[PDB]
Amino acid sequence: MVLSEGEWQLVLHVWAKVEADVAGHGQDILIRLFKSHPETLEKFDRFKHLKTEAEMKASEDLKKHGVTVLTALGAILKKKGHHEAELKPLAQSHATKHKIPIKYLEFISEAIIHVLHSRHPGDFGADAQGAMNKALELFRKDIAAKYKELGYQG
Ligand code: HEM
């Protein structure tokens, strides 16, 4: 919501580890999101037709879209909260086109945290998790504000 410089540094230190295998992370993140919250899968006309985890893992379009997620998220995180300009095209498309409730951003946030733990068991401790949770919460809160700015949501 306002992160210390130390929390931002933790977030960016973890993000460098995402950026080492963006495709792997983005794929895992989307797969965890879809398994943990199947209702979010129905939002994706391109993916609605993927059922087992093994099918999702073989979908190169799913992998590609994971990259799209994480590169966009990464650009935002690197702004360390000064992300107003980067949020609006995202808020605009997710509020008005894809028509995504903020609650779904909470689900993918949990999916990010979970995947970071499974891919970096030793690098992603309690500190880094707190910082990343805070950064993603700030992201969600700011996206929520941008929804309301566009006249949408709760
Ligand atoms: C960290 C959170 C997220 C980020 C950074 C993100 C980013 C993006 C980006 C960059 C695109 C492509 C351009 C666009 O349509 O805006 C996209 C498309 C899309 N997003 Fe997200 N997204 C996030 C969370 C979610 C969630 C949780 C859902 C649904 C449960 C969702 C649903 C969609 C859909 C349906 C599309 C269109 C994809 C397609 O064309 O097949 N997004 N997202």
Numbering used by the authors: 0 to 153
The authors write:
For example, in a previous work using the chip setup with CO-SWMb crystals, still data from 1776 crystals were required in order to generate a complete dataset; in our work, with 5° oscillations per crystal, only 138 crystals were needed. This is likely to be a combination of both oscillation and the relatively large bandwidth of the X-rays. In the case of lysozyme and CO-SWMb, which have smaller unit cells, 1° oscillation gave an insufficient number of reflections (<200) per dataset to calculate accurate scaling factors; many datasets did not have reflections in common with the others and XSCALE failed. Nonetheless, collecting lysozyme with 3° oscillation and CO-SWMb at 5° oscillation gave hundreds to thousands of reflections per dataset, which was sufficient to generate accurate scaling factors. On average, 1° of exposure at 10° s−1 led to ∼70 kGy of dose per crystal. This is tolerable for room temperature, but longer exposures, particularly on crystals with radiation-sensitive metals like the iron-containing CO-SWMb, may lead to significant radiation damage. Crystals of CO-SWMb, on the other hand, are more prone to radiation damage because of the iron in the heme moiety, but our method did not lead to appreciable changes in structure after dose. To study this, we collected crystals of CO-SWMb at 5° oscillation – far more than needed per crystal – to effectively ‘burn’ each crystal with a dose of 197 kGy.
Here, we describe a high-throughput approach to serial oscillation crystallography. Using the silicon microchip technology with fast translation that has proven to be useful for serial collection of still data from crystals at XFELs and synchrotrons, we have found that adding oscillation to crystal data collection dramatically decreases the number of crystals needed to generate a complete dataset, compared with still data collection. We tested three different protein crystals for this study: FAcD, lysozyme and CO-SWMb. The high-throughput, fixed-target serial oscillation crystallography method described here is a practical, fast and economical means to collect high-quality room-temperature diffraction data with minimized background scattering.
